[PDB]
Amino acid sequence: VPSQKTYQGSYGFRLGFLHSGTAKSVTCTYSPALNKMFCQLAKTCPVQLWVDSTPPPGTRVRAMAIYKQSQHMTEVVRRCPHHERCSDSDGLAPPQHLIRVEGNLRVEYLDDRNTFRHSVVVPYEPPEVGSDCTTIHYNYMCNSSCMGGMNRRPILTIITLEDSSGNLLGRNSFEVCVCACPGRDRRTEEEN
Ligand SMILES: [Zn+2]
């Protein structure tokens, strides 16, 4: 099981999210109280990277999903049969991978040779104009409810900052629910 231990590191690495609210039309919304993102399948999911100092050239940013519950933590998070056989390929992402990155031609996908885990990595770039952070647009390609997949089992997304040689620079994580109505689901899970 990959580490989900938070680690800000030398560069003061922390995660952020748009303050999107919970309207019916929201694609992606983050709950600070739950540390949990609610998002629609295949829709854009802004995840912000915040640093106290800019990492060196050649830095990469990796994302991986693992199951939250200890009794599923060794099971590899992957797309359901129905979705992995869907005709939604972009030509880059393997069909079995839950998490894609949209709008980045330098995206890299990895099936771990030993753990069999899936992950997706992009070059870290410095903050764009108008932002104090760097935004990556993720897409989750399976619903949490999906049969033969997650089957309503909650997952975390682990975001690691690593240098060009593989060394760990930083790590954070947030819970995800991929669902039809993110705004409503967020309100409900906070209502408890
Ligand atoms: Zn699915």
Count CB-CB contacts under 10 A for residue 70.
8
The reply, when asked if residue 97 is annotated as ligand binding, is no
The reported resolution of this PDB entry, expressed in Å, is 1.8
- From which experimental method does this structure derive? X-ray
d(CA 119, CA 124): 15
Sheet holding 36-39, edge to edge: 28-31, 36-39, 168-178, 155-162, 60-67, 118-123, 108-111
CA of 143 to the centre of ligand 1 (A): 5
DSSP the chain: ------B-TTTT-EEE-------TT-SEEEETTTTEEEE-TTS-EEEEEE-SSPPPTT-EEEEEEEESSGGGTTSPP---HHHHTSS---SSS-TT-SEEE-S-TT-EEEE-TTT--EEEEEE--PPPTT-SSEEEEEEE-S-TT-TTTTTT--EEEEEEEE-TTS-EEEEEEEEEEE-S-HHHHHHHHHH-
Tell me, in angstroms, the distance from the centre of ligand 1 to residue 16's CA: 27
Domains of the chain: 1-192 (2.60.40.720)
DSSP β-bridge partners for residue 67: 155
Residue 142 marked in a binding site: yes
Contact between 95 and 79 (Cβ < 8 Å)? yes
86 is in an annotated binding site: no
Torsion of CA 108, 75, 137, 19, to 10 degrees: -160
Instruction: Give me ligand 1 centre to Cα 11, in Å.
Output: 36
39 annotated ligand binder: no
Q: How far apart are CA 130 and CA 72, in angstroms?
A: 41
